[PDB]
């Protein structure tokens, strides 16, 4: 093998099937672990009288002769952890009076003979974890009074009887975690003095064991993954030296008001899900706590003495309770993190966080805090994170928050004022309820959750001077030419054919669209470079609602009147219906009105952007409304197209030809202008392709009101009917 000068051989992994020969008799550590040895013959170690450490782990060992290990009076460590022994080699390990460590971990041991571990008068560590043991070997373990470490972890043990570990007086560590233990008698842990660690993690425990009372030296207790529901008072009466108590993942309802009490050395208390608890624990004597967590409970108050004692408290988590009032945190000089989210706290007083130095993280989200005192955070020391999201706030103080690195206020929709950026000089992250409140910080560089972008303009509403002049020209042309067309058409008020009526009504709808465009232009002019100060007010007030109603009404009324005009042209081409068409026009106007008013009864429609347009900017909100409007307009345009195609196909009407071509031009231009609006409305809801919001805003501002100015100029320039009507108006005025 790999013989070494220091008398420590390493035969591991050589594949041999016996004890190697030709080795020095002065060796003191032999490793024959990985090679496959299936048995140990008699006097297999007669050439190693000076062994002090024998490793046989990982062989396919299945039989050890009773005299195989005879003569190893100097053996101190024996490893057999990963072999195929089905039992404790009771006869083989006899006569090993100097053994101190014995490993039997992964052997499929199912039976422990009653005379096992006899003569092992120096044994101190025993491994029996990953076998298949159904009972604790009481009598075999009674032969090991010097044992100091013991593990029975992965066995199939279901219960522990009384006095199981009576003679284990020197035992220090006991592992029993991954057994299916469900029954612990009151005297099972009797005689277990000097025991410091007890592991009962993954057992099927039902109630809290009372056998712990006989463990005065216990320092660490683990029972976390059991099904324990109630921890009674005086549960740890007999364990004054406990430092760690693992109890998470137990389905817990009640913990008792004095379960944790007079535990001087306990450093962390974490309880979650204890719903039936409604009183803050009595922790007198437990003054060395550094972390306290009581998440899921019905606690309504915090004792004023929480900081008078618990001088070393660092982290406080009282989140998912229902706490109404906050006590004075005077004291708690070591407290760093406070988590009070998801409670029901309605106000923050001036002295709520009085003193309280070294407070770095403070969480107050999901509460009902409608009032924060101006100097509430004034006395705080170095504070980094502040979270007051979803708290129903109208004002936010700024004193003492210059050192913040992260602020969160996302859910306070009543907080409409603008945060001054001269206070949060060290700010690096921010969340605000509205995208216009992050204007004062722009882009050290701060990152703000609701992006300013292009559909929440910070300085100029319309944008560049090019778009501004385009929209101004569109507004003026639409207004003046629509007024001209309306006045000329309705000046005679004597003969009103269906085509004349439809032209006039389309002009009226275009005039309303021009009024909406003028609203936008005047708002952009008045808020020139300061639209941050106007955005919240405009989007939350009635102005955006009025503008959105005007825009939607104008567009839908134009579409419906155009469809009615196409139907009328088809009817006239095929072959006394003026009353019917008047009623149809009234119905179309009513439908446009109800479609425009529907977003008012809906919520979140007209506040998507300062353009007050519901569908173009928004894709995820109001998806049904956007889809319905887009599909309705597309179906109307398809009907117009098929009607025009049929009319052209079947018809070969000198007076009617002018109206036919005018309506064809109207439907052509309106459909051409509408299709990009629908495309851009559907664009942002698809993640495959990205389209710049700036181009979206510009194309919407240009094409949405474009028909309202293109139609009247077409009618004025290219209609002999308009020419003769203008002549009639001239005769009327003169």
């Amino acid at each position, epitope marked *: 093998c790999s013989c070494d000068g220091d008398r420590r051989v390493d035969c591991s992994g050589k594949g041999l099937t016996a004890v190697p020969e030709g080795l020095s008799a002065f060796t003191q550590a032999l490793d024959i672990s990985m090679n496959n040895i*299936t048995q140990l013959p008699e006097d297999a170690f007669k050439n190693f009288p000076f062994l002090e450490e024998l490793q046989l782990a990982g062989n*396919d060992l*299945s*039989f050890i*002769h*009773p005299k195989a290990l005879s003569g190893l009076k100097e053996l101190k460590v024996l490893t057999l952890q990963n072999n*195929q022994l*089905k*039992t*404790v*080699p*009771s*006869e*083989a390990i006899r006569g090993l009076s100097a053994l101190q460590s014995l490993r039997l971990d992964a052997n499929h041991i199912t*039976s422990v*003979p*009653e*005379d096992s571990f006899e003569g092992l008068v120096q044994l101190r560590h025993l491994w029996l974890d990953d076998n298949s043991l159904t009972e604790v070997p009481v009598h075999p373990l009674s032969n090991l009074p010097t044992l100091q470490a013991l593990t029975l972890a992965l066995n199939k043990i279901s219960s522990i009887p009384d006095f199981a570990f009576t003679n284990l007086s020197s035992l220090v560590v006991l592992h029993l975690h991954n057994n299916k233990i469900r029954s612990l008698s009151q005297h099972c842990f009797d005689g277990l003095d000097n025991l410091e660690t007890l592991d009962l993690n993954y057992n099927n425990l039902g109630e809290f064991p009372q056998a712990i009372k006989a463990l005065p030296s216990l320092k660490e207790l683990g029972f976390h993954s059991n099904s324990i529901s109630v921890i009674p008072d005086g549960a740890f009466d007999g364990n004054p030296l406990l430092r760690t108590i693992h109890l998470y993942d137990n389905p817990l309802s009640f913990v008792g008001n004095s379960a944790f009490h007079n535990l001087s050395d306990l450093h962390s208390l974490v309880i979650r899900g204890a719903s039936m608890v409604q009183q803050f624990p009595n922790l007198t004597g437990t003054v060395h706590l550094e972390s306290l967590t009581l998440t899921g409970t019905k606690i309504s108050s915090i004792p004023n003495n929480l900081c008078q004692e618990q001088k070393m408290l660092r982290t406080l988590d009282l989140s998912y309770n229902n706490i109404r009032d906050l006590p004075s945190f005077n004291g708690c000089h070591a407290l760093e993190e406070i988590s009070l989210q998801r409670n029901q706290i309605y106000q923050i007083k001036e002295g709520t966080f009085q003193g309280l130095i070294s407070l770095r993280i403070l969480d107050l989200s999901r509460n009902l805090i409608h009032e924060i005192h101006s100097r509430a955070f004034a006395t705080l020391g170095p504070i980094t994170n502040l979270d007051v999201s979803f708290n129903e706030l109208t004002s936010f103080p700024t004193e003492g928050l210059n050192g913040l690195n992260q602020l969160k206020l996302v859910g306070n929709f009543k907080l409409k004022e603008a945060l001054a950026a001269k206070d949060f000089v060290n700010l690096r992250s921010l969340s605000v309820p509205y995208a216009y409140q992050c204007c004062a910080f722009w882009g050290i560089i701060i990152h703000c959750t609701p992006s300013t972008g292009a559909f929440k303009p910070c300085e100029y509403l319309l944008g560049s001077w090019m778009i501004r002049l385009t929209v101004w020209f569109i507004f003026l042309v639409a207004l003046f030419f629509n007024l001209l067309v309306i006045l000329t058409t309705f000046a005679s008020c004597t003969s009103l054919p269906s085509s004349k009526l439809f032209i006039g009504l389309i002009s009226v709808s275009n005039l309303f669209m021009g009024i909406y465009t003028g609203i936008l232009t005047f708002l952009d002019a008045v808020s020139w470079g300061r639209f941050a100060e106007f955005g919240i007010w405009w989007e939350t007030g009635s102005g955006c609602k009025v503008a959105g109603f005007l825009a939607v009404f104008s567009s839908e009324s134009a579409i419906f009147l155009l469809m009615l005009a196409t139907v009328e042209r088809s009817l006239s081409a095929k072959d006394n219906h003026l009353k019917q068409f008047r009623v149809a026009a009234l119905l179309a106007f009513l439908g446009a009105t109800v479609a425009g008013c529907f977003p008012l009864f809906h919520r979140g429609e007209y506040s998507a952007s300062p353009l007050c347009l519901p569908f173009p900017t928004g894709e995820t909100p109001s998806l049904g409304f956007t889809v319905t409007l887009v599909l309705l307009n597309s179906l109307a345009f398809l009907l117009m197209a098929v009607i025009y195609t049929k009319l052209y196909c079947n018809l070969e009407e000198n007076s009617q030809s002018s109206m036919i071509k005018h309506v064809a031009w109207l439907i052509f231009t309106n459909c051409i202008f509408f299709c990009p609006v629908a495309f851009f409305s559907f664009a942002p809801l698809i993640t495959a392709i990205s389209i710049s919001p700036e181009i979206m805003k510009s194309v919407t501002l240009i094409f949405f009101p474009l028909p309202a100015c293109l139609n009247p100029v077409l009618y004025v320039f290219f209609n002999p009917k308009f020419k003769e009507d203008w002549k009639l108006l001239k005769r009327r005025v003169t």
Partner: nanobody
Amino acid sequence: SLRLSCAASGYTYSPYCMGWFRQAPGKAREGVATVDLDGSTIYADSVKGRFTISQDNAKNTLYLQMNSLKPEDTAMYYCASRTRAGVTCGLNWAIFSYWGQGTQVTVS
């Protein structure tokens, strides 16, 4: 139909918890028939009825009678003894203190 005979010519007295074991090449030694000093006998599941164990202290021998040797009965057979007391008798190889040489039993 074989008859295995085991002789104990060295132990002074008190033949306690004798038994028979069979082994396949490279596998564990599985008990087949164990006799207590009071005459109580414990057999394996695949052994009872077919085999029989008889300890005679007049000649101080141990007999294993084998009947209807199925083809999966070929192995190496050992006899084990335990002069000392203090354990419940059974088919566990770990409790016995003395072992025999063993004979190769093949179906024939």
